[PDB]
Coordinates of all heavy atoms in Angstrom, one line a residue:
Chain A
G1320 N -0.5 59.8 -5.5 CA -1.4 58.7 -5.8 C -1.9 58.7 -7.2 O -2.7 57.8 -7.6
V1321 N -1.5 59.6 -8.1 CA -2.0 59.8 -9.4 C -1.1 59.1 -10.4 O 0.0 59.5 -10.5 CB -2.3 61.2 -9.7 CG1 -2.8 61.4 -11.1 CG2 -3.2 62.0 -8.7
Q1322 N -1.6 58.2 -11.2 CA -0.9 57.2 -11.8 C -1.1 57.1 -13.3 O -2.2 57.4 -13.9 CB -1.2 55.8 -11.1 CG -1.4 55.9 -9.7 CD -1.4 54.6 -9.0 OE1 -1.8 53.5 -9.6 NE2 -1.1 54.5 -7.7
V1323 N -0.1 56.6 -14.0 CA -0.1 56.4 -15.4 C 0.9 55.3 -15.8 O 1.9 55.0 -15.0 CB 0.1 57.7 -16.3 CG1 0.0 57.4 -17.7 CG2 -0.9 58.7 -15.8
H1336 N 9.1 23.7 -14.9 CA 9.1 22.4 -14.4 C 7.8 22.0 -13.6 O 7.4 22.7 -12.7 CB 10.3 22.2 -13.4 CG 10.3 21.1 -12.5 ND1 11.0 21.0 -11.3 CD2 9.7 19.9 -12.5 CE1 10.9 19.9 -10.7 NE2 10.0 19.2 -11.4
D1337 N 7.1 20.9 -14.0 CA 5.8 20.6 -13.3 C 5.4 19.2 -13.9 O 4.7 19.2 -14.9 CB 4.7 21.6 -13.6 CG 4.7 22.7 -12.6 OD1 4.6 22.4 -11.5 OD2 4.8 23.9 -13.0
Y1339 N 3.6 15.4 -12.9 CA 3.0 14.5 -11.9 C 2.1 13.5 -12.7 O 2.2 12.4 -12.4 CB 2.2 15.3 -10.9 CG 1.4 14.3 -10.0 CD1 2.1 13.4 -9.2 CD2 0.1 14.2 -10.0 CE1 1.5 12.5 -8.4 CE2 -0.6 13.3 -9.2 CZ 0.1 12.5 -8.4 OH -0.5 11.6 -7.6
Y1342 N 3.4 10.4 -14.0 CA 3.9 9.4 -13.1 C 2.8 8.3 -13.0 O 3.3 7.1 -12.9 CB 4.1 9.9 -11.8 CG 4.6 8.9 -10.8 CD1 5.9 8.5 -10.8 CD2 3.7 8.3 -9.8 CE1 6.3 7.5 -9.9 CE2 4.2 7.4 -8.9 CZ 5.4 6.9 -8.9 OH 5.9 6.1 -8.0
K1343 N 1.6 8.6 -13.1 CA 0.5 7.6 -12.9 C 0.8 6.3 -13.8 O 0.8 5.2 -13.2 CB -0.9 8.2 -13.2 CG -1.1 9.6 -12.6 CD -2.3 10.2 -13.3 CE -3.1 11.1 -12.3 NZ -2.1 12.0 -11.6
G1346 N 4.5 4.3 -13.1 CA 4.6 3.4 -11.9 C 4.0 2.1 -12.3 O 4.8 1.0 -12.0
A1347 N 2.9 2.0 -12.9 CA 2.3 0.7 -13.3 C 3.2 0.0 -14.3 O 3.0 -1.2 -14.6 CB 0.9 0.9 -13.8
Chain B
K619 N -0.8 2.1 -1.1 CA -0.3 3.0 -2.2 C -1.4 4.0 -2.6 O -1.1 5.1 -2.9 CB 0.2 2.1 -3.4 CG 0.7 2.8 -4.5 CD 1.3 1.9 -5.5 CE 2.0 2.7 -6.7 NZ 2.6 1.7 -7.7
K623 N -1.2 7.6 -2.2 CA -1.3 8.4 -3.6 C -2.3 9.6 -3.3 O -1.9 10.7 -3.7 CB -1.8 7.4 -4.7 CG -2.1 8.2 -5.9 CD -3.5 8.5 -6.2 CE -4.3 7.3 -6.5 NZ -5.8 7.6 -6.7
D626 N -0.4 12.0 -1.6 CA 0.3 12.7 -2.7 C -0.6 13.6 -3.5 O -0.1 14.8 -3.8 CB 1.1 11.7 -3.5 CG 1.7 10.6 -2.7 OD1 2.1 10.9 -1.5 OD2 1.9 9.5 -3.3
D627 N -1.7 13.1 -3.8 CA -2.8 14.0 -4.5 C -3.0 15.3 -3.6 O -3.1 16.4 -4.1 CB -4.0 13.2 -4.8 CG -3.7 12.0 -5.5 OD1 -2.6 11.8 -6.1 OD2 -4.7 11.2 -5.7
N630 N 0.3 17.4 -3.6 CA 0.5 18.0 -4.9 C -0.6 19.0 -5.2 O -0.3 20.0 -5.8 CB 0.5 16.8 -5.9 CG 1.5 15.8 -5.7 OD1 2.4 15.9 -4.8 ND2 1.5 14.7 -6.4
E634 N 0.0 23.3 -6.4 CA -0.4 23.8 -7.7 C -1.6 24.9 -7.5 O -1.7 25.9 -8.1 CB -1.1 22.6 -8.5 CG -1.5 23.0 -9.8 CD -0.4 23.4 -10.8 OE1 0.7 23.5 -10.4 OE2 -0.7 23.6 -12.0
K637 N 0.1 27.5 -6.7 CA 0.8 27.9 -8.0 C -0.2 28.6 -9.0 O 0.1 29.7 -9.4 CB 1.4 26.7 -8.7 CG 2.5 27.1 -9.7 CD 2.8 25.9 -10.6 CE 1.8 25.8 -11.7 NZ 1.9 24.5 -12.4
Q652 N -5.1 51.3 -9.9 CA -6.0 52.5 -10.2 C -6.6 52.1 -11.5 O -6.3 52.8 -12.5 CB -5.3 53.8 -10.2 CG -5.0 54.1 -8.7 CD -4.6 55.5 -8.5 OE1 -4.9 56.4 -9.3 NE2 -3.7 55.8 -7.5
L693 N -8.2 61.8 -11.6 CA -7.7 60.5 -11.4 C -7.4 60.2 -10.0 O -7.5 59.0 -9.5 CB -6.5 60.2 -12.3 CG -6.0 58.7 -12.5 CD1 -5.4 58.5 -13.8 CD2 -5.1 58.4 -11.3
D694 N -6.9 61.2 -9.2 CA -6.6 61.0 -7.8 C -6.0 59.7 -7.5 O -5.2 59.2 -8.3 CB -8.0 61.1 -7.0 CG -8.5 62.5 -7.1 OD1 -7.7 63.5 -7.3 OD2 -9.8 62.7 -7.1
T695 N -6.3 59.1 -6.4 CA -6.0 57.6 -6.2 C -7.3 56.8 -6.5 O -7.8 56.1 -5.6 CB -5.5 57.4 -4.8 OG1 -4.9 56.1 -4.6 CG2 -6.6 57.5 -3.7

Side-chain angles (χ1 to χ4, degrees):
Chain A
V1321 177
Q1322 323 191 334
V1323 185
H1336 164 201
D1337 268 307
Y1339 176 62
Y1342 181 76
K1343 311 165 151 47
Chain B
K619 180 171 184 178
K623 180 260 288 183
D626 313 334
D627 306 348
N630 304 349
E634 187 69 355
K637 197 197 84 192
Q652 289 191 27
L693 188 153
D694 294 331
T695 197

